[PDB]
Structure formats: structure tokens, C-alpha cells
Amino acid sequence: QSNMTNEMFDLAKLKSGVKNKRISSTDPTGGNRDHLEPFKPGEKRIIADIKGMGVINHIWVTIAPPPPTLSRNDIIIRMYWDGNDYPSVESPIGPFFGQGWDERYNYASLPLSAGPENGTGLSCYFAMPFEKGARIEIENQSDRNIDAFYFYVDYLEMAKLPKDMGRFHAWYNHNLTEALPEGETEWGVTGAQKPNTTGERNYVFMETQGKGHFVGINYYVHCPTPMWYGEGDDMWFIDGEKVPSLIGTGTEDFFNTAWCPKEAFSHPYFGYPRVNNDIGWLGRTHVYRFFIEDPIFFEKSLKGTIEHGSNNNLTLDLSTVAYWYQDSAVALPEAPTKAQRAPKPFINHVDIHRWRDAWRKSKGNKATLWGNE
Amino acid sequence: QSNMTNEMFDLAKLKSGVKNKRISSTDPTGGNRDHLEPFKPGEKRIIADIKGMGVINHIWVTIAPPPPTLSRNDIIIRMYWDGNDYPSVESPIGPFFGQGWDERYNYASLPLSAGPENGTGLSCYFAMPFEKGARIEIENQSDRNIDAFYFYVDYLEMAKLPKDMGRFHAWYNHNLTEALPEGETEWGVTGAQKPNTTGERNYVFMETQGKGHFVGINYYVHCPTPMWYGEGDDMWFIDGEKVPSLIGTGTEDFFNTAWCPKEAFSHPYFGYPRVNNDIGWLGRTHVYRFFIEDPIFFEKSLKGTIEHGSNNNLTLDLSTVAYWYQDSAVALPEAPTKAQRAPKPFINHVDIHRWRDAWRKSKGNKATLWGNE
Amino acid sequence: YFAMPFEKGARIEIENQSDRNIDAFYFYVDYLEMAKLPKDMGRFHAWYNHNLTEALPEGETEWGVTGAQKPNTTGERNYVFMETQGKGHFVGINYYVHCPTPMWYGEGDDMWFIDGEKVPSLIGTGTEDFFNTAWCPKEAFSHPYFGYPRVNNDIGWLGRTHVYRFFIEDPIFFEKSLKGTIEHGSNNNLTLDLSTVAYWYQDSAVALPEAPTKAQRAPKPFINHVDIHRWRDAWRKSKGNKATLWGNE
Amino acid sequence: GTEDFFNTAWCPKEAFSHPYFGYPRVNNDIGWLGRTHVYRFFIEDPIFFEKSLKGTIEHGSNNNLTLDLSTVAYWYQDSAVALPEAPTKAQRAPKPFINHVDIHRWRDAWRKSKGNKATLWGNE
Ligand code: NA
Ligand code: NA
Ligand code: NA
Ligand code: NA
Ligand code: NA
Ligand code: NA
Ligand code: NA
Ligand code: NA
């Protein structure tokens, strides 16, 4: 028999052992109230409770009111596989679907998109297998109601889950990173640069034990300086090795870009859906990269890290969502609190004028200092 | 007889006692070398030497090479009336025609314009009367040649100059303004604000003795802070009065605008042909206002001033060209030197990162300082 | 908004020279009736002209690219946009050029002959220069007195450009006669489809030259990629048809 | 046709993007004068061969045109094999853009081929 194969060729093949199912917020009366009842502040609800074996292969969500009225940073999505009492997916729902902070913007990637109206249509095509059921939970951590929650959870019921199917995991992390004691010595501008010989101060976006593969990252940086935020290298520790086997060259480099960019760009596997649009790199940037053709495999463990500026010199407000598969459904590290992951204010002309004043006083408060001395 | 009058009605009236003349860089051989011979660095030349009585009423100029190769800040135009050995017009030619620094950009006002190609076509419609001749001089203060200087000087020869005709004056000034000893306390952000009751430290754009009226100002600000540069009031001292009779409210206010604007805008009498296009008001802004319907009259003297920030608190790189008429051709103050009027570098992300570092040090270098503390 | 005085009446006529109907003609003619017209009021004149200008016998030697340039000391072959006898002043020009080459069309100087003088007293430097612009521009631009309301939007300066200049603050006065001219390329070397409307005042209402006919003033087709490919073929033949000629030889 | 082969039609000169084909750089000038980059990937639809393959394209209909053409071809085969000799640096140097001065010279040759009549428009 011919070994011919590819996406469109295989689509033409008849498939066995699959049955479509869908859980949605459809009005059970047949009327047009096709959303769930409101969520009060703090309320949690299991929106999908599936029994047996299957594979989720399409999720769509929308929420009312839209941002900024209701921030999607403050609505949590959690997923529990195989009857476990811990979630294997835990993230603020906006960041999970590639919508950072309390913002909204259209973008499309192969697994995740936020489509019209202006980033409110959330869709996910990651496949999520399960053997002993699946539960999807929504938690309202906002101070106001979720007036209407709309969704589709499309999945294939299977009499027998194939051999070697993994379990989908996703974890949101956040850190307000610590500058070096000598200060933010990026590019050696304010002081001498030093080597990062351990990666111990790197930001950690993923850390797990098991067998599997890493498949994606949504990276949300809020930079409080106009200085370039992305000199930092990605560094991966596979299966408990002491020296990281995968070491990068820069953050834009890791995201398949170059030369300190700040341009919107779209590829099915990587892109910049939101750029800072200000002096230098001051403000917010969202970058993503999916490792679909090129996952990062591990047999025993994986620790995915990235420098926050060269040798971790910069103070950055960083949040990430990491996506991966592993052999069984495992627990995640404790989530950041609502207060910990709150979006920070944009540095503005008043703040920078105060920096200029401190700088002028450090130079003897000479009446004709330009600013480049 | 009817007293009907207006611009288009009066244009239809036959005129007496005028004859067109034109001095131009036309090729005297009839060939197509319709520009003057090159100017070496430092070279001066009288480009127009008119005898007798007349009124210049249209000037056009262009120069090769164009900016930034050849800066029009470093080519001086001077005009001498009535056989005087001093100029009554003295300015870098770009700033005289509304092209600041070493830049080029299209704009149109009623008396002055810089038209296509991208601001290289310079035109002037101010009327310039003279009774005992006129001399127009060009000086190359660049380090390279003026390869080709093109011009038209259109004027009306008159057998009798009407007796109340004034003399056109224009003066370029430049200052790197001095901050207050306590620093740049704009908006009271870095420290307490204090009153300016005298205008003693105001920037001076015009000062003269005679009878006449002020008709215009080109204002070129290069602001080295993102802070708003224009809280400063215009203040005019007419006929040696101790308290200024005309006191304004702000710089954008004086330029018929409001609320710290940074948008391109065009009116025959006022506008913003070049805006800073960066964080806050950091960078370069060109603003103009012509006082055609509303001149500032004086019978003995005029001193035109403006604050450089409220109570002159800011360090600004400021240059101006002031335009006016007075009863006779008078002398001007010494011109700024080439070094004094040199364009300043743009403050950039590296400079501001150094300000941030001095500011972090002033706050005790807490490792997670955001920037708004 | 031009003011148009008259002492013994005024008549405004419309003529349809199209092959189809004018379905609807709308207008306002606002005027001031005066018991006494002030005595120094002139009369408004405007004249449309059109020429398909003739290249020099040696060809279109603009910029000395195809051959040596020669001086124009007389203005003999210049395009004429206005010629009249009387006392008055010129106040404006609408200039409509259709250039059939990508070469810059505007090296030509304006040249004015006032009151029958033998040597023109007003001589310019270039067409864009005369229109208060510089450096072979092709950008839309607007000033109350001058501008480019329609630009060629193609390679070089191939196609149509409309330029205007009004002489309101700075009219060109004359006591006996005026002849307003402009070169069509330096030393009138170029073939240009040129039309103009000249506007002026003079002491009495005078006659105009015969108008161009409908056929004479018909818009010309735009030179296109097929035409230029045919030029390339004749040029390749002139170079001996080397199989790899690029085009800049 | 070439645009046809690149899944387009009607002599296009518009930027366009598909995962398998597109125009990332278009000529932006009169007609099709200047530079165009087109690509097509045969991922779902490769061109298979058991023994050999020769991939060719006409340079204008019946190869009538002078074009400056360069290509990169990508493929798989059963073993690692050698390639033809590379063009030299000088051979693959980018050519100058034809400009208004060059075309005015073509116009002059064309006018002289038509008897150098003073009122030739250009479409005769
Ligand atoms: Na429904
Ligand atoms: Na329904
Ligand atoms: Na190490
Ligand atoms: Na690096
Ligand atoms: Na000339
Ligand atoms: Na000439
Ligand atoms: Na004020
Ligand atoms: Na000329």
C-alpha cells in the first residue's frame, strides 16, 4: 500500500471510532438566551462535565461585558482530566487565548485566535485527550458580574482512546522581575555587564516532571523603560541535566525575529499581535511561538526559562502561558493571585520628567543639561 | 463714489505708478543652467542689487544639494535697505522660510511656504518697500558647497514710493534656555512653582526702537524632556512701559490652539507644520503665527517675549524668526554663530535609560522599582 | 470669486460642444448692481489655449540626454498662454500638461514681454520654479495662490499634471501690451500636450484669439506599457539587437 | 502562465499571502517594470519523480523576453547528491532599475525610427 500522506490527503480518508459531541451555552428552551446565567463576583461553575474517553478538538468562548469593562485577566479557566481533583490547565482566560492584560485585539495563530469583534471571539484548536472524563471550570475573580458567558466545547467521543495519547497542560505564570544589585546594566550602558553562568535568576515559564513535549508560549511583557527588553536568552533544562542543552541568543531571536523589532507580524506558528507603539520599547508587547512542527521533547522533566534582560538585569512585568503535553494529567504550581497578576500602569511623560530631574541633580543640577551627558 | 472694497474687488481696479521687474538666476546665455555658480564654504555674494524706489512682493528660492546633505540652517540670507551698511533682515534661510533645523517638510501659510519636492520650494509674499535701493546677500556657512542656488526676486519699480510705506525686518534668534536653579518644576511635578511677575528670564524673540508693527513669528522648539514644553506665556512690552500690556496664557494658546496639542494643522495665519511624533512632547515642534489682520503696533519700541516653560523653568533648545515693519530700516542684534544655532541630538531610549538609572539610585535601588514611585 | 466689473451690461453664454445632451445645467451668478461704477474698474478676461508642442528637429534633447542642448535667447518657439494690447495686469494661470515621456517636463522658463520690449524683462528658471515649487515635484499641494491639484502618479512625470498660480498680491502689470510665454522643455525641446487658461484685467473689454476647436483640444490617450515596449523594441534595434540588452546601455 | 503557476491570474502586481504561495514584493511601477518576488510551495501537492526531474519555465511566451531571473528550488531525494555549479558573485549581482532617463532614450530611438516627426505622441 502507498504511504502517501499530508493534511489534505489524510482529510479525504474515512475515519473510524469517533463520534461528535458538543456542550454549549445553547438556550435549553430553544429560545435565544444562548449564554449561561450571570456569574456573581467570586463564583465558580463547572461549564462542561464529560464522562468516559474522548478528545476535545475545538473550543470557542465569548464574554459580556467586553474589555475594559470586564477584564479577561480576572476570569479563570481550569481543566481537570481523568477525574483528578487538581487542574492540569489553569490560566486567566484572556491570556490563555492570546489576549494579554485587560486588552482586546484581533489576531490569528494556528492553535489560538482572538477574532472579531476586536478580539472578543476566542477559539482554540489544541487537541485534549482524556480517558476517565473531563471537567472545564470557569471562575469569576472580577469585582463585577460576568453578565453572559457563551461557549462551544466540541469533542470526539471514542470507544477506545488511541495508544500513546498524552494529556494537555497549560500554566499561567507572572513575575515583576528583579533588577541586578548594580542596576539595569543592559547593553553595558549604566555599568559593566557580567556573565550568567547558572541561569538561576532566569524567569521560569514551565517546570514539570513526566514524559512529553512542550508546544507553545504566549509571552506578555510590560517594559517600564524605553530600553530594549529582549536581550535575554531562552534556556531549557531537559531531564534534570545540570548544563542546559538548549540555549538561545535573544528574546526576539527565540520568537523568530531580529534586531529589537516592534512591528505587528503574523505567522501560523509565531507573531507579535500587540506592539508597544511608543518610544523605544516602553510599554506592552505580546509575542507568541508555537512548537507544532518542532516541539521540545522530554523523557523525565523539563524546565523552560528565559533571561529578563541580559544576565537578568532588567525589571520587567512579565506573564506567560506555557502549553504542553505529558503522559498523564499532573498538577501545576500555585497560581499567582489576582493582585499579583494585576496589569501595571503605563510609564508616562510625568514619570520620565521625574527621572530626568533625578538625573539632572546627579549631574550637579547644571541649568543647561541637555540629557545625553 | 462707492467705498466698496475687498481683496477680489480691489484686484479688478487698474493700478497706477507700478512697473514689474525681476532679478533671477536665469541662465544669461539662454541655456538651461538657470542657477548661480557654486558657493564655496564661507563665500558671500550679493544676489540682487536694486537701485531706486520699489517694493519686493514675491521671492522664490531653491537650493542644491537638498537637506540633510546641505543644511538650510547654514545658509544665511541678509537684506539691506536704502544703502545701509547693516542688514534689516538676517536669518538662516531655512528658518526664514519656515523650515526648521536641518529638516524639510511641505507646508503652506499665507506669507511663507515650503512646497514640493518635500519642502524644497521656498516662497515669500511679504511686501518689502525701499526708497534708496535694496541689496540681498547670501552667505554659505556650510562646510560644503552650495552646488546651485536658484531664485526669483519679483518687485515693483515705483516713480514715487507712497509716503507711509514701512521697511520689512526679520531676525533669527536662538537660545539653549536655562532651567531654574531648583530644576524643571513644570506643573509642580518635581517641586513647588513660583510666580513670574516681571518676565525677566523670558526668551526674547524681538526687540526694536521705532514706529511700526510686528507681523509674525516662526517658533522652533526642540524639547529634551517628554514633559509639555508650552505652559509659557507670551509677554509684550510696548513703548517702554514697565508692566507688559499684552500677557498671554500659554504657548499653544498664543498659537491659537489648546490642551498641549501635537497634531499637524494648517491655517493661513497659524499652524503646526512639524510635530514631535514621540512620547509626550519630546523632540521637535515647529509652530507659527502671522499677525496680518491683528498686528502688534508700537510708536516708540517693542519687546516681544515668551516664557520657556511656566516661570521659565525648562531647558529648551529654542530658535525663532520674528517679522515686522517699522518706519525706517534699522540694525539688528548680532546673529547667533553657526556653533550656537547647531541642531541638537534627539534624546533617545539610551539617554532615558540612564535617567531611569539615576532615578532608581535616588529611590534606594529597590530591585522592583516600576518608575512611577 | 474673481470680480468682473461692467458698465454697459453683461452676457454669459453656454455652448454644448459635446455629442450628448447637457441634461441639467445649474448655476448662480451673484453680482452687485451699482448706480455708479468706480472709474478705475477694469474688465475681466480669460482665454483658453491649447498646443501639441513640437519637438526640436534634433529631437527631445532634455537634460542633454539624447543630444547636445542649445540656448534659447529669443523665446521664439515658446508656448504662448496670453497676448493682449491695453493697460492692465495678469492675475492667473491654470496649466494642464499631458507629458508623453517619463522625462521631467518642466525645465522650461517663463518669459514675459511687457509693452513691446525686445528683450523680455521677466525671465524665469523652470516650470516648477515658476509655480513656487522645486526639484521636479509630483506631489499634490495646496496654497491659496498656487498648487498641484492633480499629479501624474506614474513613472517619472509620464501622464497628466495640473498646476496653477494666481498673481493676486503680485500681478504682472502692463501699460500697452503683454505677452506671457513659457518654454515647453528647455529650449522648447519637448513634445507636450499643453493647455492653459490665462486670467487678467485690462482697461476695456477686448477680443480674444480664435478658440482651439473641439478636435484640437481633445484629451490625448495615456502612454502605456504596450507603447513603451514598442519604444524598447526600436531602441534594441538601434543597439544591434544584442539578445541580453538591459535597457540602460 | 507564470502568474497561473503561482495560483494567481490576469497579470497581477498586488502583495498577497497564503501559507503555500504569494507575492511578498511587487514592482510598484508602470506596468510590470522592476522587481517581483513570487513563491509557491508544493507541500500538499509535490512533484514526484522515480528517476529524474527537470523543472523549467518560459521567460515570456516562447522565451521571447530578456529577464533578470533568479530562483531557489527546494526538493527531497533518496540520497544526498551534488548540485550544478553555482553562479558567481558577479553573475548574480542585482541589476539597476530601468528609469525615466533610460526610457526617454528608448523614446528617442523610437521617434527616429518613425522619421523624427516633431509631433509624435508615442502610440503611433
Ligand atoms: Na442554541
Ligand atoms: Na437558541
Ligand atoms: Na554554566
Ligand atoms: Na542575548
Ligand atoms: Na532662464
Ligand atoms: Na534657461
Ligand atoms: Na501659562
Ligand atoms: Na530652465
Compute the distance between CA of residue C135 and CA of residue B117 in angstroms, rounded to an integer.
Answer: 6
How buried is residue B161: exposed, middle or buried, by Cβ count under 10 Å (0-12/13-18/19+)? middle
- Under DSSP, the state recorded for A159 is S
Determine the distance in angstroms separating the CA of B264 from the nearest CA of chain A, rounded to an integer. 19
Q: Nearest Cα to C61, choosing from D22, D104, B176, A235?
A: D104
How buried is residue C36: exposed, middle or buried, by Cβ count under 10 Å (0-12/13-18/19+)? exposed
Pairing status of strand B283-290 against strand B128-130: unpaired
Compute the distance between CA of residue B233 and CA of residue B241 in angstroms, rounded to an integer.
Answer: 18
The answer to whether B222 touches B101, Cβ cutoff 8 Å, is yes
Q: Is D109 on the interface with A (CB under 8 A)?
A: no
* Architecture of the domain defined by B163-373: Sandwich (2.60)
* Cell numbers at C191, concatenated: 513634445
Q: Choose from B352, B360, B366 for mutation: most chain A CBs within 10 A.
A: B352
* Cell numbers at D83, concatenated: 548540485
User: Residues with beta carbon < 5 A to ion ligand 2?
Assistant: A 27, 34
**Residue in C closest to D101 by C-alpha:** C103
Compute the count of residue pairs across chains B and C with CB atoms less than 8 Å apart.
Answer: 160
Compute the distance between CA of residue C130 and CA of residue C109 in angstroms, rounded to an integer.
Answer: 8
CA distances from C36 to B234, C7, C43, C199, C202 (A): 48, 9, 15, 25, 19
Pairing status of strand A89-92 against strand A167-176: parallel
b (16+ CB within 10 A) / e for A167-188:
bbbbbbbbbbbbbbeebbbbee
Resolution in A: 1.6
β-sheet bridge partners, residue B151: B61
Identity at B356, one-letter amino acid code: R
The answer to whether C198 touches C46, Cβ cutoff 8 Å, is yes
Cβ within 8 Å, pair B352-A228: no
**Residue in D closest to C238 by C-alpha:** D109
Compute the distance between CA of residue C110 and CA of residue C223 in angstroms, rounded to an integer.
Answer: 27
Compute the distance between CA of residue C17 and CA of residue B360 in angstroms, rounded to an integer.
Answer: 80
Q: What angle do CA B294, B299, B304 make, to 5 degrees?
A: 60
User: Residue A269: CA atoms inside 13 Å, Cβ hemisphere, count?
Assistant: 12
Q: What angle do CA C68, C73, C74 make, to 5 degrees?
A: 125
Which residue from B189, B190, B370 is facing A224, i.e. has the nearest CB? B370
Residue A138 host element (H or E): strand A134-140
| Region of residue A10 (left: phi > 0; alpha: psi -120 to 50; beta: else) | alpha
* Cell numbers at A47, concatenated: 461549564
First to last CA, chain D: 29
- Under DSSP, the state recorded for B13 is B
- Under DSSP, the state recorded for B36 is B
Pairing status of strand B112-115 against strand D21-25: unpaired
| Region of residue A143 (left: phi > 0; alpha: psi -120 to 50; beta: else) | alpha
Do A1-162 and A163-373 show the same overall fold? yes
Compute the distance between CA of residue C91 and CA of residue C174 in angstroms, rounded to an integer.
Answer: 12
Compute the distance between CA of residue A94 and CA of residue A100 in angstroms, rounded to an integer.
Answer: 6
Cβ within 8 Å, pair D123-C65: no
The answer to whether A166 touches A326, Cβ cutoff 8 Å, is yes
Q: Nearest Cα to A168, choosing from A321, A6, A335?
A: A321
Distance of CA B228 to the CA centre of its chain: 21
CA of A347 to the centre of ligand 7 (A): 25
Compute the distance between CA of residue B291 and CA of residue C240 in angstroms, rounded to an integer.
Answer: 66
Q: How was this structure determined?
A: X-ray
Going by C-beta distance under 8 Å and a sequence separation of 6 or more, which residues neighbour residue B244? B199, B235, B236, B237, B238, B305
Which backbone phi and psi does B236 adopt, to 5 degrees?
-115, 130
Sheet strands (E) in C9-152: 43-52, 79-85, 88-99, 110-114, 122-123, 141-143, 146-150
The answer to whether A289 touches A254, Cβ cutoff 8 Å, is yes
Determine the distance in angstroms separating the CA of D100 from the nearest CA of chain C, rounded to an integer. 5
Helices (H), A27-67: none
Class of domain A1-162: mainly beta
Q: Contacts of residue B155 in chain C, CB cutoff 8 Å?
A: none
* Cell numbers at A16, concatenated: 473510524
DSSP-derived 3-state class of residue C155: coil
Identity at A133, one-letter amino acid code: G
Q: Alpha-carbon dihedral of residues D6, D11, D14, D17, nearest 10 degrees?
A: -10
Q: Contacts of residue A268 in chain D, CB cutoff 8 Å?
A: 19
CA distances from A344 to A202, B74, B358, B369, B372 (A): 21, 47, 22, 12, 10
Q: Choose from C60, C143, C199 for mutation: most chain B CBs within 10 A.
A: C143
Compute the distance between CA of residue A87 and CA of residue A170 in angstroms, rounded to an integer.
Answer: 9
- Interchain touch A–C (≥3 Cβ pairs closer than 8 Å): no
Cβ within 8 Å, pair B11-C3: yes
* Cell numbers at A115, concatenated: 477574532
| 3 state SS for chain D | CHHHHCCCCCCCCCCEEECCEEEEECCCCCCCCCCCEEEECCCCCCCCCCCCCCCCCCCCHHHCCCCCCCCCCCCCCCCCCCCCCCCCCCCCCCCCCCCHHHHHHHHHHHHHHCCCCCCCCCCC
The answer to whether B272 touches B141, Cβ cutoff 8 Å, is no
Q: Choose from D41, D44, D78 for mutation: most chain A CBs within 10 A.
A: D44
Going by C-beta distance under 8 Å and a sequence separation of 6 or more, which residues neighbour residue B318? B174, B175, B176, B177, B203, B219, B220, B221, B222, B308
Q: Is C172 on the interface with B (CB under 8 A)?
A: yes
| DSSP state string for C111-152 | EEEETT-SS-SEE-S-HHHHTT--SS----EEETTEEEEE--
* Cell numbers at D10, concatenated: 490576469
Q: Nearest Cα to B310, choosing from B245, B229, B236?
A: B229
DSSP-derived 3-state class of residue C231: helix
Domain C39-249 has CATH 3.30.1490.20: no
Determine the distance in angstroms separating the CA of D97 from the nearest CA of chain C, rounded to an integer. 9
Going by C-beta distance under 8 Å and a sequence separation of 6 or more, which residues neighbour residue A341? A73, A92, A172, A174, A319
Domain limits of chain A? 1-162, 163-373
Cβ within 8 Å, pair D99-C63: no
Q: Contacts of residue C103 in chain B, CB cutoff 8 Å?
A: none
β-sheet bridge partners, residue A322: A171, A217
CA of C113 to the centre of ligand 6 (A): 16
Which backbone phi and psi does B60 adopt, to 5 degrees?
-130, 140
Residue B216 host element (H or E): strand B212-223
β-sheet bridge partners, residue B159: none
Identity at B216, one-letter amino acid code: G
Other Cβ atoms within 10 Å of B264 Cβ, number: 14
Other Cβ atoms within 10 Å of B125 Cβ, number: 20
| 3 state SS for A309-335 | CHHHCCCCEEEEEEEEEECCCCCCCCC
Q: Choose from D13, D28, D30 for mutation: most chain C CBs within 10 A.
A: D30
CA distances from A66 to A24, A77, A101, A149, A286 (A): 20, 17, 13, 11, 20
Residue A96 host element (H or E): helix A93-96
DSSP-derived 3-state class of residue B304: strand
Q: Contacts of residue B345 in chain A, CB cutoff 8 Å?
A: 370, 372
**Residue in B closest to A350 by C-alpha:** B227
Compute the distance between CA of residue A323 and CA of residue A128 in angstroms, rounded to an integer.
Answer: 11
User: Residue C38: CA atoms inside 13 Å, Cβ hemisphere, count?
Assistant: 15
How buried is residue D92: exposed, middle or buried, by Cβ count under 10 Å (0-12/13-18/19+)? exposed
CA distances from D97 to B117, B165, C137, D14 (A): 22, 56, 20, 19
Q: Alpha-carbon dihedral of residues B141, B144, B148, B152, nearest 10 degrees?
A: -10
**Residue in C closest to B25 by C-alpha:** C125
- Under DSSP, the state recorded for A245 is S
